[PDB]
Design an enzyme around this catalytic site. Structure first.
Site, PDB file in Angstrom:
ATOM      1  N   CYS A 194       0.840  -1.195   0.000  1.00 52.55           N
ATOM      2  CA  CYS A 194       0.000   0.000   0.000  1.00 52.55           C
ATOM      3  C   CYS A 194       0.875   1.245   0.000  1.00 52.55           C
ATOM      4  O   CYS A 194       1.887   1.309   0.703  1.00 52.55           O
ATOM      5  CB  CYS A 194      -0.917  -0.003   1.236  1.00 52.55           C
ATOM      6  SG  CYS A 194      -2.115   1.365   1.382  1.00 52.55           S
ATOM      7  N   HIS A 200      -9.392  -3.218  -2.387  1.00 51.06           N
ATOM      8  CA  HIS A 200      -8.361  -2.508  -1.640  1.00 51.06           C
ATOM      9  C   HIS A 200      -8.686  -1.014  -1.585  1.00 51.06           C
ATOM     10  O   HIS A 200      -8.628  -0.393  -0.516  1.00 51.06           O
ATOM     11  CB  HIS A 200      -6.996  -2.728  -2.312  1.00 51.06           C
ATOM     12  CG  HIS A 200      -5.857  -2.019  -1.641  1.00 51.06           C
ATOM     13  ND1 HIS A 200      -4.869  -2.690  -0.949  1.00 51.06           N
ATOM     14  CD2 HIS A 200      -5.534  -0.707  -1.580  1.00 51.06           C
ATOM     15  CE1 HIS A 200      -3.988  -1.818  -0.490  1.00 51.06           C
ATOM     16  NE2 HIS A 200      -4.367  -0.607  -0.859  1.00 51.06           N
ATOM     17  N   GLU A 201      -9.045  -0.433  -2.733  1.00 47.76           N
ATOM     18  CA  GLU A 201      -9.348   0.995  -2.778  1.00 47.76           C
ATOM     19  C   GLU A 201     -10.626   1.358  -2.040  1.00 47.76           C
ATOM     20  O   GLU A 201     -10.677   2.373  -1.348  1.00 47.76           O
ATOM     21  CB  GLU A 201      -9.435   1.500  -4.225  1.00 47.76           C
ATOM     22  CG  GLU A 201      -8.161   1.333  -5.045  1.00 47.76           C
ATOM     23  CD  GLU A 201      -6.888   1.707  -4.296  1.00 47.76           C
ATOM     24  OE1 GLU A 201      -6.941   2.503  -3.329  1.00 47.76           O
ATOM     25  OE2 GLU A 201      -5.820   1.202  -4.697  1.00 47.76           O
ATOM     26  N   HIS A 255     -10.236   1.472   1.684  1.00 51.54           N
ATOM     27  CA  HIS A 255      -9.691   2.747   2.130  1.00 51.54           C
ATOM     28  C   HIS A 255     -10.792   3.746   2.453  1.00 51.54           C
ATOM     29  O   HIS A 255     -10.650   4.563   3.365  1.00 51.54           O
ATOM     30  CB  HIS A 255      -8.779   3.346   1.061  1.00 51.54           C
ATOM     31  CG  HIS A 255      -7.360   2.882   1.141  1.00 51.54           C
ATOM     32  ND1 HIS A 255      -6.603   2.994   2.288  1.00 51.54           N
ATOM     33  CD2 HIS A 255      -6.544   2.345   0.204  1.00 51.54           C
ATOM     34  CE1 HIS A 255      -5.381   2.548   2.054  1.00 51.54           C
ATOM     35  NE2 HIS A 255      -5.318   2.148   0.796  1.00 51.54           N
TER      36      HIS A 255
HETATM   37  C1  LIG Z   1      -3.355  -5.520  -5.165  1.00 52.37           C
HETATM   38  C2  LIG Z   1      -4.190  -4.559  -4.386  1.00 52.37           C
HETATM   39  C3  LIG Z   1      -4.170  -3.138  -4.948  1.00 52.37           C
HETATM   40  C4  LIG Z   1      -2.894  -2.427  -4.583  1.00 52.37           C
HETATM   41  C5  LIG Z   1      -3.010  -0.892  -4.644  1.00 52.37           C
HETATM   42  C6  LIG Z   1      -1.634  -0.246  -4.222  1.00 52.37           C
HETATM   43  C7  LIG Z   1      -1.851   1.314  -4.279  1.00 52.37           C
HETATM   44  C8  LIG Z   1      -2.642   1.728  -3.025  1.00 52.37           C
HETATM   45  O1  LIG Z   1      -2.000   1.828  -1.960  1.00 52.37           O
HETATM   46  N1  LIG Z   1      -3.940   1.938  -3.102  1.00 52.37           N
HETATM   47  O2  LIG Z   1      -4.643   2.268  -2.155  1.00 52.37           O
HETATM   48  C9  LIG Z   1      -0.513  -0.816  -5.117  1.00 52.37           C
HETATM   49  O3  LIG Z   1      -0.385  -0.524  -6.295  1.00 52.37           O
HETATM   50  N2  LIG Z   1       0.310  -1.649  -4.493  1.00 52.37           N
HETATM   51  C10 LIG Z   1       1.382  -2.434  -5.111  1.00 52.37           C
HETATM   52  C11 LIG Z   1       1.025  -3.918  -4.843  1.00 52.37           C
HETATM   53  O4  LIG Z   1       0.772  -4.274  -3.696  1.00 52.37           O
HETATM   54  N3  LIG Z   1       0.996  -4.777  -5.876  1.00 52.37           N
HETATM   55  C12 LIG Z   1       1.282  -4.430  -7.304  1.00 52.37           C
HETATM   56  C13 LIG Z   1       1.112  -5.738  -8.028  1.00 52.37           C
HETATM   57  C14 LIG Z   1       0.285  -6.614  -7.131  1.00 52.37           C
HETATM   58  C15 LIG Z   1       0.661  -6.198  -5.707  1.00 52.37           C
HETATM   59  C16 LIG Z   1       1.808  -7.069  -5.173  1.00 52.37           C
HETATM   60  O5  LIG Z   1       1.522  -8.263  -4.830  1.00 52.37           O
HETATM   61  C17 LIG Z   1       2.794  -2.061  -4.568  1.00 52.37           C
HETATM   62  C18 LIG Z   1       3.854  -2.616  -5.526  1.00 52.37           C
HETATM   63  C19 LIG Z   1       2.974  -0.563  -4.427  1.00 52.37           C
HETATM   64 ZN   LIG Z   2      -3.677   1.271  -0.382  1.00 50.00          ZN
END
Ligand SMILES: CCCCC[C@H](CC(=O)NO)C(=O)N[C@H](C(=O)N1CCC[C@H]1CO)C(C)C
Ligand SMILES: [Zn+2]
Ligand SMILES: CCCCC[C@H](CC(=O)NO)C(=O)N[C@H](C(=O)N1CCC[C@H]1CO)C(C)C
EC number: 3.5.1.88
Length: 185
Positions: free
Chosen positions: A111, A154-155, A158
């Site tokens: 996150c 996830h969003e 929040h």
């Molecule tokens: C999967 C659930 C949605 C994640 C959203 C988050 C962005 C966020 O904090 N939203 O509130 C993100 O891109 N997070 C990434 C993340 O957790 N990811 C990106 C690919 C899938 C997953 C890793 O397992 C990291 C790399 C910053």
């Molecule tokens: Zn998040």
């Protein structure tokens, strides 16, 4: 004006634990501009050039509370394995129905508001139906599955003062959730 990591607040800020306020629609220029900047942020974060130009951590979604705005707004820009793009800028997004069956990323979730790693499966409903109003002003009804469904949950979490780690198992992060299966292609 555009968003950067400086605008993203981290865990500890009470706003991340409050319930975002419903956005009055038709949306005002202010709320429209906030949302416009949110989806711009997410898309720019995935462009190496832009991400460096503004030191943006790549991400696939964003919720208004994360940038200090306690209103029901989210931005999602994720591409699934088939190369299908799900790009949405939404006001008042809500899950009107979700499957009983669950799924999860085996590598867990990260996150932008959490400057630390929290290992463990984050159980998510495999399929969800979301209703919201696009930034363009039209109401939308989306049926999502897999990664897109995970990002939406996830969003939207929040917006309800819920963090991803709130879902991780208690003292056994890698236990197989009842009625579920790792994310499929
Ligand atoms: C999967 C659930 C949605 C994640 C959203 C988050 C962005 C966020 O904090 N939203 O509130 C993100 O891109 N997070 C990434 C993340 O957790 N990811 C990106 C690919 C899938 C997953 C890793 O397992 C990291 C790399 C910053
Ligand atoms: Zn998040
Ligand atoms: C620690 C991660 C272990 C995951 C292993 C699985 C292996 C599998 O059985 N695939 O069908 C995988 O690649 N799954 C994919 C996956 O998690 N990936 C693919 C690219 C990297 C990573 C997402 O962060 C799907 C679910 C998206």
């Amino acid at each position: 004006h555009m968003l950067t990591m400086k605008d993203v607040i981290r865990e500890g800020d009470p706003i991340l634990r409050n319930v975002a306020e419903e956005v009055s629609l038709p949306a005002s220029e202010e709320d429209t501009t906030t949302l416009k900047e949110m989806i711009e942020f997410v898309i720019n974060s995935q462009d190496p050039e832009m991400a460096e130009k503004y030191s943006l951590r790549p991400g696939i979604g964003l919720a208004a509370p994360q940038i200090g705005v306690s209103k029901k707004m989210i931005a999602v820009h994720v591409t699934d394995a088939d190369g299908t793009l799900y790009s949405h800028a939404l006001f008042n997004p809500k899950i009107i129905s979700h499957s009983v069956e669950r799924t999860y990323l085996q590598g867990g979730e990260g996150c932008l508001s959490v400057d630390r790693e929290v290992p463990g499966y984050v159980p998510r409903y495999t399929r969800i139906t979301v209703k919201a109003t696009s930034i363009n002003g039209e109401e939308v009804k989306l049926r999502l599955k897999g990664l897109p469904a995970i990002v939406f949950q996830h969003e939207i979490d929040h917006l309800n003062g819920v963090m991803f780690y709130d879902h991780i198992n208690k003292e056994n992060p890698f236990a197989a959730p009842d009625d579920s299966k790792p994310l499929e292609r």
